[PDB]
Amino acid sequence: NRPNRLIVDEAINEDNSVVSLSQPKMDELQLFRGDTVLLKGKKRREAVCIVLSDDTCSDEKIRMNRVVRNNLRVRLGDVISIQPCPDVKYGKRIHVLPIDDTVEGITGNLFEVYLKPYFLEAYRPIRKGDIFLVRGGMRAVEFKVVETDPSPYCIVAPDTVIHCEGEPIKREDEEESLNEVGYDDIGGCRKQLAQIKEMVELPLRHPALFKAIGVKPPRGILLYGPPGTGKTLIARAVA
Amino acid sequence: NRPNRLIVDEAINEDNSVVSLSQPKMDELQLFRGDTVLLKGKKRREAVCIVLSDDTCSDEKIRMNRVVRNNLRVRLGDVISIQPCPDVKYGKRIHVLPIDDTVEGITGNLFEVYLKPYFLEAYRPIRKGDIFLVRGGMRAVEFKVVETDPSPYCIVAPDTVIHCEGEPIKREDEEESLNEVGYDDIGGCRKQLAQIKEMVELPLRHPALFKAIGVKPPRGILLYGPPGTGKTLIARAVANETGAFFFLINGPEIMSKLAGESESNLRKAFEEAEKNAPAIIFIDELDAIAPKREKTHGEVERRIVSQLLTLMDGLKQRAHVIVMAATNRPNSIDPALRRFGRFDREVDIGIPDATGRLEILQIHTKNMKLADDVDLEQVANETHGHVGADLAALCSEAALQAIRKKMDLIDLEDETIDAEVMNSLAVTMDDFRWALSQSNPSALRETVVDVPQVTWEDIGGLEDVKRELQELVQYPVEHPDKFLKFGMTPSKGVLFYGPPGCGKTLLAKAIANECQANFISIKGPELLTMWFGESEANVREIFDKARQAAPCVLFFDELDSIAKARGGNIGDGGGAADRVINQILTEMDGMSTKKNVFIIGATNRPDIIDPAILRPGRLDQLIYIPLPDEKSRVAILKANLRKSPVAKDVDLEFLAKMTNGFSGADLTEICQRACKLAIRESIESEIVPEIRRDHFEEAMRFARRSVSDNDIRKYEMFAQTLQQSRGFGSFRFPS
Ligand SMILES: Nc1ncnc2c1ncn2[C@@H]1O[C@H](COP(=O)(O)OP(=O)(O)O)[C@@H](O)[C@H]1O
Numbered sequence: 005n006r007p008n009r010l011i012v013d014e015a016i017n018e019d020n021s022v023v024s025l026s027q028p029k030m031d032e033l034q035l036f037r038g039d040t041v042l043l044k045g046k047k048r049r050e051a052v053c054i055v056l057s058d059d060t061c062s063d064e065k066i067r068m069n070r071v072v073r074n075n076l077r078v079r080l081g082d083v084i085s086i087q088p089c090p091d092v093k094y095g096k097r098i099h100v101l102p103i104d105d106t107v108e109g110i111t112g113n114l115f116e117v118y119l120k121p122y123f124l125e126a127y128r129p130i131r132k133g134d135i136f137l138v139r140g141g142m143r144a145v146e147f148k149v150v151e152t153d154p155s156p157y158c159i160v161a162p163d164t165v166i167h168c169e170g171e172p173i174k175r176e177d178e179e180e181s182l183n184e185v186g187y188d189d190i191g192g193c194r195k196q197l198a199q200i201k202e203m204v205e206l207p208l209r210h211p212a213l214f215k216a217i218g219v220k221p222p223r224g225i226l227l228y229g230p231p232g233t234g235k236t237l238i239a240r241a242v243a
Numbered sequence: 244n245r246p247n248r249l250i251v252d253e254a255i256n257e258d259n260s261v262v263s264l265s266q267p268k269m270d271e272l273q274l275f276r277g278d279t280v281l282l283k284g285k286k287r288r289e290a291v292c293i294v295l296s297d298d299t300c301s302d303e304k305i306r307m308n309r310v311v312r313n314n315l316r317v318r319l320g321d322v323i324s325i326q327p328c329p330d331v332k333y334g335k336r337i338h339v340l341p342i343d344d345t346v347e348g349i350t351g352n353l354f355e356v357y358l359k360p361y362f363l364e365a366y367r368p369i370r371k372g373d374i375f376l377v378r379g380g381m382r383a384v385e386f387k388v389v390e391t392d393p394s395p396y397c398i399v400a401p402d403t404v405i406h407c408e409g410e411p412i413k414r415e416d417e418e419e420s421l422n423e424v425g426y427d428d429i430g431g432c433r434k435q436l437a438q439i440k441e442m443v444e445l446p447l448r449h450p451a452l453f454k455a456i457g458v459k460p461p462r463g464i465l466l467y468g469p470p471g472t473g474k475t476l477i478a479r480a481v482a483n484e485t486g487a488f489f490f491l492i493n494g495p496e497i498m499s500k501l502a503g504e505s506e507s508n509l510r511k512a513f514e515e516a517e518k519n520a521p522a523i524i525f526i527d528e529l530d531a532i533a534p535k536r537e538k539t540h541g542e543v544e545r546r547i548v549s550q551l552l553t554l555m556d557g558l559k560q561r562a563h564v565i566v567m568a569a570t571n572r573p574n575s576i577d578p579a580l581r582r583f584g585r586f587d588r589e590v591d592i593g594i595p596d597a598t599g600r601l602e603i604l605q606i607h608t609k610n611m612k613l614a615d616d617v618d619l620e621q622v623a624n625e626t627h628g629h630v631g632a633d634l635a636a637l638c639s640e641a642a643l644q645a646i647r648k649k650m651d652l653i654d655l656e657d658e659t660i661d662a663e664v665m666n667s668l669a670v671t672m673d674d675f676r677w678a679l680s681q682s683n684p685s686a687l688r689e690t691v692v693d694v695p696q697v698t699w700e701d702i703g704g705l706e707d708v709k710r711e712l713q714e715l716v717q718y719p720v721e722h723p724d725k726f727l728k729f730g731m732t733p734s735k736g737v738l739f740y741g742p743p744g745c746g747k748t749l750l751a752k753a754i755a756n757e758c759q760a761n762f763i764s765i766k767g768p769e770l771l772t773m774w775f776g777e778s779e780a781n782v783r784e785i786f787d788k789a790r791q792a793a794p795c796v797l798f799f800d801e802l803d804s805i806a807k808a809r810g811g812n813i814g815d816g817g818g819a820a821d822r823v824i825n826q827i828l829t830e831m832d833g834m835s836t837k838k839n840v841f842i843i844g845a846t847n848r849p850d851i852i853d854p855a856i857l858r859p860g861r862l863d864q865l866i867y868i869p870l871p872d873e874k875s876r877v878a879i880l881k882a883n884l885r886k887s888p889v890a891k892d893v894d895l896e897f898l899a900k901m902t903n904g905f906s907g908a909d910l911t912e913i914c915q916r917a918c919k920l921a922i923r924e925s926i927e928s929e930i931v932p933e934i935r936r937d938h939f940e941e942a943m944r945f946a947r948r949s950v951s952d953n954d955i956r957k958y959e960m961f962a963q964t965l966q967q968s969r970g971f972g973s974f975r976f977p978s
């Protein structure tokens with residue numbers, strides 16, 4: 005059954021480039037703990053991150069964060085093929101710049117405030133064309149890789165230096181804005197959010213499944229609770 | 244009279260090619276049991292099937308299924324000529340293909356999934372041009388015969404092989420779609436569906452009969468019941484199975500229009516169906532159409548109500564249309580529509596029982612398969628407060644959860660699903676039990692009507708009372724001649740008084756199962772709710788519900804509950820009269836004594852009962868239930884220990900002896916406590932599967948009698964005062 009494809013799931017860690025996998029799952033690939041793992045999903049984009057350890061997730065699934073889901077253009081309930089890449093790679097020339105939608109109203113240097121306390125003692129394989137978000141400065145800032153040395157063989161290292169011009173770019177509709185709501189913005193609602201997740205996944209992720217079969221999917225989903233609980237937040241996140 | 248033509252009827256078997264006939268009917272044709280029978284109806288189509296045996300259908304009729312009715316283009320209430328055909332015929336070349344309306348979204352092979360497990364060891368004479376439906380793959384699939392070897396002399400056999408091209412065809416309006424509703428989609432509704440069947444057959448199947456005669460057929464047929472019972476399902480089935488045009492009028496659809504247009508829609512909805520006579524006009528809901536009870540608001544609402552009223556009584560024959568309506572709340576209809584000529588027939592359909600609910604599960608799961616450990620008998624017991632629509636959602640959720648459990652890690656990234664996996668998808672107990680927890684019943688506050696399954700074998704002792712009850716409610720209903728000849732009226736009701744716990748509720752429940760009648764139970768707090776709420780008019784609906792549900796029995800538990808709430812033995816500044824019992828007394832005077840209804844009153848304090856109910860015409864028969872004796876207590880325990888297998892060393896005859904003031908209910912908690920010990924010790928020793936003697940010995944320490952010792956003499960002194968059979972011992976005459 006080609007045991008190299010796993011189903012995605014929401015991550016429990018607050019870090020950006022972290023992949024959560026179980027101990028029994030990790031030995032099936034015959035791989036080590038501290039390394040770089042390559043992820044191939046759909047839409048001919050690739051993703052490489054750092055794999056971690058888990059012990060309570062499931063029998064066979066992958067837990068990946070929201071920022072790394074945007075690079076692969078994949079969503080919850082989708083299958084992705086994972087393959088290892090045990091090769092040593094460094095970085096020589098890195099050219100990145102943020103988008104004006106998040107750096108509008110910010111002056112001064114853009115290196116010692118967001119680029120230095122982000123990549124220190126991290127060793128993250130930043131791939132070309134990836135979009136990552138940095139948290140700090142009591143606001144949300146996201147960057148993008150425009151051009152660099154030809155990928156692969158690109159990892160941020162202290163030997164290389166970062167340079168930026170200063171002018172932003174214009175984004176398109178191909179990528180999804182990280183400022184929108186998601187599954188990581190819901191707290192406390194664990195038992196009740198799962199019912200909505202399972203009631204909506206089938207009739208949306210597989211529209212053709214219900215079109216052929218005669219099973220009647222639920223139409224109306226009425227929400228309750230005192231004002232301010234987040235009924236609109238859940239409705240927007242599940243969409 | 245050419246005894247070869249029989250009337251059609253619905254089949255009771257779930258098989259497709261089965262013809263049901265009685266044993267006396269079968270010898271009239273001089274034919275054998277296992278063979279092929281030829282049926283000739285109308286429209287120059289023929290049909291051949293396999294005849295079976297029956298013993299409870301009728302004197303002379305044929306019972307045939309719905310799929311075989313479509314081939315002959317015949318409906319219920321039609322005559323068909325049957326003739327035998329004793330000739331051996333085989334099959335050589337068969338070419339069949341389904342229609343795209345049912346195989347849209349299915350890929351893979353179409354032979355080993357639906358054609359092989361359909362014709363094996365069957366030997367069905369499939370005729371050319373016939374349409375048959377196959378059930379499987381958790382969906383409905385139907386095929387059709389396009390061309391083959393020239394009929395007759397065509398029977399499917401293992402020697403021949405089946406071939407299919409792959410491209411579908413396009414159907415026409417000549418054949419009726421099997422995906423529509425029918426008479427086989429109704430479960431539990433047996434007594435009430437027959438009234439609609441007989442009320443609609445004559446004015447639709449024979450429109451010319453009523454056109455020549457002056458008999459006035461019923462026009463309006465109002466439907467009742469909580470939402471989800473299937474009022475629309477019945478309305479569509481009776482229109483599809485009678486060949487009449489069905490028109491659906493939604494409640495909010497009229498209201499969604501602006502001023503004037505909503506008025507025009509109702510007017511234009513009548514002559515449109517008039518030209519297509521016969522026709523049936525159905526109204527979805529009437530709460531949002533004519534809520535003229537306390538609204539008294541809006542200028543267009545009254546205009547719409549009056550337009551509907553004028554369109555009701557304005558049907559001066561002309562066509563042969565029958566108008567039907569459905570309302571969930573019987574009390575939410577204006578009396579103007581209830582007048583004669585608009586709505587004179589009322590049908591009240593209630594929540595089905597366990598037997599009725601099991602048929603709903605069988606109906607809604609006929610297209611899907613189930614595992615061997617899957618039984619629908621258990622799920623029909625815990626869903627006591629579920630409506631017929633709740634079971635459809637329950638089975639749909641059970642089917643859906645299977646996909647999320649078995650088709651979660653597969654991730655078949657395909658544009659169209661296959662059939663070799665969908666058929667193999669089975670549903671187990673773990674799928675249904677999860678759906679039971681998530682299901683929320685929508686009908687748990689209304690008064691449910693059910694026939695209890697308790698018989699006289701479950702009541703221990705009290706043999707003297709049973710004969711008195713069997714001789715009071717069963718003779719006037721089954722020997723009316725001896726009551727009409729003497730001219731003396733039967734008794735109205737009976738009163739049960741005595742110490743609590745003797746099982747007065749069981750006596751009322753057992754008499755309902757023997758008489759094959761309904762049973763309505765009212766508890767104590769149900770009466771106090773109206774007394775505290777200052778609304779005594781709610782009992783009128785309770786009385787009216789029992790009337791239409793004939794035959795029925797009425798039960799009133801602890802009628803003295805209101806008297807105890809105002810002082811009890813000491814009473815208060817007033818008398819023994821209140822407002823709840825006043826309405827019951829007023830309604831018992833106006834109720835018809837000729838109906839198959841009965842009222843049973845239960846009480847435990849006869850000293851506080853209002854004497855206004857004992858005077859002749861309301862309640863005269865008083866039955867006293869004394870304390871159980873030693874010989875009667877053995878039977879109580881024997882009947883109680885029937886649900887759970889017990890050992891042989893349990894000497895119940897000994898337990899009967901030391902029990903002196905223990906009532907019938909005083910022994911149930913003893914058995915419950917003894918049974919709890921077995922579970923406790925099994926779970927404790929898990930880290931044996933039979934009840935032991937020592938369990939009953941331990942339960943004797945907590946033997947608490949619910950009745951005291953001072954009130955025992957009060958019942959005896961009351962009974963001896965009421966009877967007083969002293970003085971006149973034995974008198975004789977000199978000659
Ligand atoms: N459970 C929650 N978790 C995170 N944020 C929340 C939650 N509930 C409410 N909020 C925040 O409160 C703001 C207002 O929410 P609101 O529209 O009032 O929710 P609702 O429509 O359910 O009352 C939103 O912008 C949302 O970010």
Ligand SMILES: Nc1ncnc2c1ncn2[C@@H]1O[C@H](COP(=O)(O)OP(=O)(O)O)[C@@H](O)[C@H]1O
Nearest residue numbers: 428429430470471472473474475476631632635
């Ligand atoms: N007694 C029943 N037997 C079979 N199916 C039923 C029954 N009652 C309801 N259903 C199913 O429930 C669905 C919804 O019915 P609904 O329109 O709510 O009935 P009503 O209009 O009487 O409330 C229908 O598609 C029908 O198939």
Ligand SMILES: Nc1ncnc2c1ncn2[C@@H]1O[C@H](COP(=O)(O)OP(=O)(O)O)[C@@H](O)[C@H]1O
Nearest residue numbers: 701702703743744745746747748879907908911
């Ligand atoms: N004579 C009897 N035979 C068998 N079981 C009895 C008898 N009397 C009472 N019970 C059991 O005791 C239980 C409680 O009855 P209860 O409601 O106290 O009766 P009542 O309302 O007449 O006092 C019932 O479930 C019934 O099974």
